[PDB]
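Q: Joint fold for the lines below.
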Amino acid sequence: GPPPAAVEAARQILREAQQ
Amino acid sequence: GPPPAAVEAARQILREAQQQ
Amino acid sequence: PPPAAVEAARQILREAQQQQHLYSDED
Amino acid sequence: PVTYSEPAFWCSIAYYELNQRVGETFHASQPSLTVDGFTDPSNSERFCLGLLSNVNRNATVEMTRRHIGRGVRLYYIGGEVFAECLSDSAIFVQSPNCNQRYGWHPATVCKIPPGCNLKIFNNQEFAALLAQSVNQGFEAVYQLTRMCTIRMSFVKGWGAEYRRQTVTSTPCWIELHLNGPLQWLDKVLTQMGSPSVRCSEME
Amino acid sequence: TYSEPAFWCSIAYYELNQRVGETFHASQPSLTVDGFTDPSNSERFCLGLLSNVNRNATVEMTRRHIGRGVRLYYIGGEVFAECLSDSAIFVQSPNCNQRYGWHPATVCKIPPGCNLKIFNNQEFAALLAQSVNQGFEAVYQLTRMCTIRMSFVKGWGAEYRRQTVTSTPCWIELHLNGPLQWLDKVLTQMGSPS
Amino acid sequence: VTYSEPAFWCSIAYYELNQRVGETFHASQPSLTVDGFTDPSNSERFCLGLLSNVNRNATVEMTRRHIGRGVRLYYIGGEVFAECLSDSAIFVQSPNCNQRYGWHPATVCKIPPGCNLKIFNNQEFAALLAQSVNQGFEAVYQLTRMCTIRMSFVKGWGAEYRRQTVTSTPCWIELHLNGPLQWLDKVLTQMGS
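A: Joint structure:
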């Protein structure tokens, strides 16, 4: 599957872009 | 033209150059 | 050789030696 | 852990004539800037293309450069980037982020007529695509580099039914890099591993 | 809005048709462009450190002869070039050419130890004011007056086998920022293409 | 003529094939990495993955995907080192390194993943500079070549490879060592001829 660290990094960026 | 502001801008530059 | 060039190179040699013996160099 | 710091410049802009880079790269610090066809070398909010030299330049490029005039205003507000055509001639924008947004072919070139404006980039949409691309693998994330670049031609269109079929056939064009998005991409791409097949040193 | 240019000129170096190295920006009235190697003097543009993996034997030989090079200096509204090199330099300055009644493309030799006034700001400003009355194109073409090109060692034009500056092995292109900003103040007021 | 200490210990220019790509990077800290990623704003990282070149070919595109963690370059105690952090090798042409070990000056040395190499020693350059003074203007003038180091990612070049010159490699960098260059200027300006 995908690398969980990359998923988490992308998740934090999506949060930052929402803020 | 030329537009009045272009003539004015060039006039000020010529004065600045002459003082220099 | 031109003496000003020998003197420049002499000071550079000194500086290069100092670089190999900084006070913080433990090894 | 790698350190990250906020970009001092939200974008960089490189100018080209045909296939040739012309002039130094411009770096924008304030939220709004103009790229125009005039000649001030010293305004940090104006990238003035008229002073840039190209001893090799042909007649079509010279003629086209006289029409840039007031050019394009580029501005970054609330996570979005806009381009407003101040020139009396249209500008033509290839924004992969717009093309994704509207379901257009990735190479689509969108005209901005004089007086009009286009949202050329939305940060949230980019971040959403970045997260979706992780699940598709290294190559899908690596390809997002292209999303962080927008190319714009002054005066002349290219693509589709235009005679010019590639940006390097247009006489006067700019390439914008969006630094915020590039840094976000770096944070993800550095966690995506390597390509699946290795690369020989000899081939 | 305008602010005084922090740098009076910028200089780009070329070998034949290829840009070589970064653009140099000058902030003090005098600078030298030389063939030596200091990367870190704000008043010397040292061409001898610049690399070009594509350079040919003619360029390598020319670079050996740049030497002390050219001193370029800006005093009292005028710009001067002095040949410090033991080989000549060759200057194409349309502002200088117009002053002497020469063809705009004239390339003037400056032999070792000689100098030439390559620009006069008052002549440019007078031409700019005259050009406004002649229309947009006349003002736009004045961008060419703000660029001066110079070759080391090898001439070009007229009698020479080399007919363009891009055929010379080592040359520089100077932009004069003060004249460019003056030109902007007028060009931006001349009126839009419609 | 007066001198001031270089603000940057090196500058680095990237190339694809025979063409410069992107702006020159200037290193302001002792260690930096040149890598295949995309941060524009770290003064210790020259990220080549963000640099554009429309119409680059498939071989350059492929090589760029394998730069990865790239090379760590660092300067300490008068010496410069290169460490291959990439999962692909890097190939270094440093005349200072080649002379120290007795190899031909144009030798290209492979640094495999995880390995390092001392690519420059300032003292050996200073000794060679002082020796060259006694040999004449030309001997000193040629030492500019010692102050530049070329390195390719992924693809070898030179006598051992089909690729003959560095300009046939898809991704390479050229380092200028500013301290040595200024030292050379202090001597060369006094040599005459």
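Q: Anything notable?
A: The helical segments of chain B are 4-19. The two ends of chain B are 29 Å apart (CA to CA).
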